[PDB]
């Protein structure tokens, strides 16, 4: 007697979050390359 985890909701949620993603730009994490600049020099 065991209820396995269900991927349906996760995908529902994940796609719903993807719907909120505007066309910005793909960027890789800081450890990989980091293409972002830090707000400073002040």
């Amino acid at each position: 007697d065991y209820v396995q985890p269900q991927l349906r909701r996760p995908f529902e949620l994940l796609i719903a979050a993807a719907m909120e993603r505007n066309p910005t730009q793909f960027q890789l994490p800081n450890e990989l390359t980091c293409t972002t600049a830090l707000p400073g020099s002040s």
């Binding site: 396995q4 985890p5 269900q6 991927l7 349906r8 909701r9 996760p10 995908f11 949620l13 994940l14 796609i15 979050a17 993807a18 719907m19 909120e20 993603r21 505007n22 066309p23 910005t24 730009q25 793909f26 960027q27 890789l28 994490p29 450890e31 990989l32 390359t33 293409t35």
Partner: protein, 172 residues
């Protein structure tokens, strides 16, 4: 959110991701878009890979769930940030030339792996329970290891042409 989901990028695929980024953005080299091995076929590979590697598998519920989910997830998110600023002309060209082209099609492995890199922060949007999280991260890592096992055979960076100057004008 409460738990920042660390999808964990495979260290075997990191050198490839760094090279991918460099090849596209810095080298400005781009391959001929038409992908014989599209995302749909990759999903099919992965799905059947489970049942053939195992013996008495019944996780097809989740396998099919994942395939359907990934397909739509990749499709819906395609164009937003599943491609670099340099890949814009590819997106533009596909839609303009083939308005009937599926976003889950035309592109191959590099774009599906692209998804797994961006899904890291995407999972930070989604408050998933431990059960579903562990199970899912399992599949994702199984997928990642499936790709990583074929990093040299599947992923090919040699057949990349330096994108023509006029084509650069369709990106930047």
């Amino acid at each position: 959110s409460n738990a920042e989901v660390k999808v964990k990028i495979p260290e075997e695929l990191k050198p490839w991701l760094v090279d991918d980024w460099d090849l596209i953005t810095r080298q400005k080299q781009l391959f001929y878009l038409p992908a014989k091995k599209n995302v749909d076929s990759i999903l099919e590979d992965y799905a059947n890979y489970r049942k053939s590697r195992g013996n008495t598998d019944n996780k097809e519920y989740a396998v099919n769930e994942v395939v359907a989910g990934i397909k739509e997830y990749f499709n819906v998110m395609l164009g937003t940030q599943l491609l670099y600023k340099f890949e814009r002309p590819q997106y533009a060209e596909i839609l303009a030339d083939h308005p009937d082209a599926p976003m889950s099609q035309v592109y191959g492995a590099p774009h599906l792996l692209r998804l797994f890199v961006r899904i890291g922060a995407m999972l930070a949007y989604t408050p998933l329970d431990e059960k579903s999280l562990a199970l899912l991260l399992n599949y994702l890592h199984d997928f990642l290891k499936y790709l990583a096992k074929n990093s040299a055979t599947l992923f090919s960076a040699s057949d990349y042409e330096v994108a023509p100057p006029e084509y650069h004008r369709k990106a930047v």
